[PDB]
Structure 1
């Protein structure tokens, strides 16, 4: 608990400490540390350092540094002095998958990555063609082009497009222009659903430059994607971690995480090395304006 800020590394502290509270992450990287015998070694070197310092505090209190991970990452991909948490999350998860594929537990693909379906349905013959893509997070809009809901926002992503009028979908089966529904659907799910909020903006011919949207969505606690699922399943997901940004740009600012333990049923708000605690009731009523607004939402299969 408590990740030392290394000079504008709150982007890395927030994402790593959310990763630390992921259902399968702890056990997975320990499994991979025993398989090997060098990002997975650095991950375990930090986790051991984190777990051991928690035990030292647990016995007798007095008044850990993710520096091990940073030096490994910089040798892995020298992007680094302050970046976006979303880009670094991809480089971490992507490289764990790149090594997992080269070794042959399928860690990253099972619990972060899901399967996406691009379905077109000719309304004249009702023949369904689908296209498969993989996805590890849901890019979601906040405002349109007041306080919109998250169901609306996911509906924007998993849109349905009705093809009627001068432009009709040509069905190869019907051999003729036809009316069609073109929809986006979720098939296979990961253990943790990441929601990436497009909460940044830009304008024209004054100031400045970029701008952040200081009006977040109505975030629910329960989440079911049955409405967009390829075949309605009763799986339900529960919010457990939220990364938030303070600032008016994407390049730099304060990144902070608010993770829930699943203290059972509470909120562990921690920033850099400065750790705090909050309640359930006075946190969801805190997101609406206000030093920061959310950027990433993580739900898990409860």
Structure 2
């Protein structure tokens, strides 16, 4: 059933919101429930993956309106990320990043055409970082830097486990802003390695490998002389058929995603509340998780201006 709520241990709604999103990440949940993790590290430590998996196993063997305590779990993520030792308000995406890095580390199994360069860079990355967690989240960006003087296009390939998107509004607009030709001029002029001097260049991202689970993180922040504030712009994201083919490095590479979870924030950059909306893998039905409270909702209520992290699964 999987509708247990999580106890708020003291400003830990950022943590509970992300844990529900992961609980309803189908392949990640299954990995824990079949305890494939015991089968599978960067150090001697396994307690973070153990408590994370026991938390998921407890949520999925629980009855509605059970409340589960993530206390043991918190003790372990703190050791990876001391930022979380206290009970202060925190950012869900920062939490997600340290949590997945920790899980990953504990079960870590460890002149050419551009195409070929990318494929070789990828292998180099997997030679160092290769886990079931990565399997799910990891993708590869291509970045093309072209000198406007000599026309050389320098290409590099960076792994990613999520994308942090500027807000342009539609989600696609934000992806186009992320992937646009960026003109690097004036104080940002790069050195062209062929010209061997500073030149106006154009830099452009495309997606060389798409991940099985695509986490999109909306940069709801604005820096000004007058104030740092949160952007509460409504960003309209689809429930189904998010089609990212126009962003792919390769023409055909099809990449269509359906939403299954959202972490919501309400407030300013300095404080606020988190909840999650998540689609159950089993039933397809959506529920609102606001700590210990879990209520059904319709997918028509899922898009709101409070969405901050979007969890999509590849179709």
Q: What's the TM-score bracket when you normalise by the shorter of the two chains?
A: 0.7 to 0.9
Where does structure 2 lack aligned partners over 5 or more consecutive residues? 111-129
1:277 corresponds to 2:296: yes
The partner residue of 2:243 within 218, 221, 224 is 224
1:213 aligned to 2:234?
no
Partner of 1:67: 71
Could you say which residue in structure 1 is the equivalent of 2:56? Answer: 47
Look up the SS of the partner of 2:61 in the other structure.
Answer: helix
Matches within 5 A, 1:180-259: 182-204=203-225, 210-221=228-239, 222-232=241-251, 233-250=253-270, 252-259=271-278
Give distance in 1, aligned partners of 2:66 and 2:242: 41
- Give the length in aligned residue pairs: 280
Give the alignment's TM-score, normalised by structure 1.
Answer: 0.80
Match of 2:154 in 1: 129
TM-superposed deviation, 1:21: 0.8
Is 2:30 the counterpart of 1:27? yes
Distance 1:240 1:63, change over 3 A: closer
1:211 and 1:177 map into 2 onto residues whose CA distance is 34
Change (3 A) 1:183 1:45: same
In structure 1, stretches of 5+ residues that fail to align are none
Is the 2:144–2:156 Cα contact (8 Å) retained in structure 1? yes
SS at 1:227 equivalent: helix
Distance 2:139 2:12 in 1: 29
Would the aligned equivalents of 1:171 and 1:177 in 2 still touch at CA under 8 Å? Answer: no
**Where does residue 12 of structure 1 map in the other structure?**
15
Report the Cα distance in structure 1 between the residues aligned to 2:18 and 2:301, rounded to whole angstroms.
23
Structure 1 segment 278-293 matched on structure 2, within 5 A: 278-284=297-303, 287=304, 293=306
Counterpart of 2:101 in structure 1 is 94
Deviation at 1:168, TM superposition (A): 10
Deviation readout 1:221-245 (Å, 9 max, x if unpaired): 3212211111131221011111111
Q: CA separation in 2, counterparts of 1:298 and 1:85?
A: 13
The alignment partner of 1:298 has SS state of strand
Contact 2:162–2:214 (CA under 8 A) maintained in structure 1: yes
Shift of 1:213: 2.1
Deviations 1:120-144 (A, max 9, x none): 35689976531111111111122x5
In the alignment, the residues of structure 1 paired with residue 285 and residue 134 of structure 2 have an alpha-carbon distance, to the nearest angstrom, of 29
Residue of structure 1 in register with 2:131 after alignment? 106
Residue 117 (structure 1) aligned with residue 126 (structure 2): no
> Does the Cα contact within 8 Å between 2:5 and 2:66 map onto a contact in 1?
no
Equivalent-residue separation in structure 2 for 1:19 and 1:160 (angstroms) = 34
Mapped partners of 1:25, 1:62: distance in 2? 22
Residues 61-70 or 215-224, more deviating? 61-70
Instruction: Call closer, same or farther: CA 1:253–1:176 in 2, change over 3 Å.
Output: closer
Could you tell me how far apart the structure 1 residues matched to 2:197 and 2:275 are?
55
CA distance 1:262–1:126, shift in 2 (3 Å) = farther
When residues 108 and 178 of structure 1 are mapped into structure 2, their CA distance, relative to the original with a 3 A threshold, is same
CA gap of 1:127–1:275, structure 2 versus 1, over 3 A, is same
Q: Greater Rg, structure 1 or structure 2?
A: 1
Superposition TM-score, scaled by structure 2 size: 0.77
User: Residues 191, 263 of structure 1: CA spacing in aligned structure 2 closer, same or farther, 3 A cutoff?
Assistant: closer
> Cα offset for 1:248?
1.4
Q: Say whether 1:297 aligns with 2:300.
A: no
Please report the RMSD computed on the Cα atoms of aligned residues, expressed in angstroms: 3.2
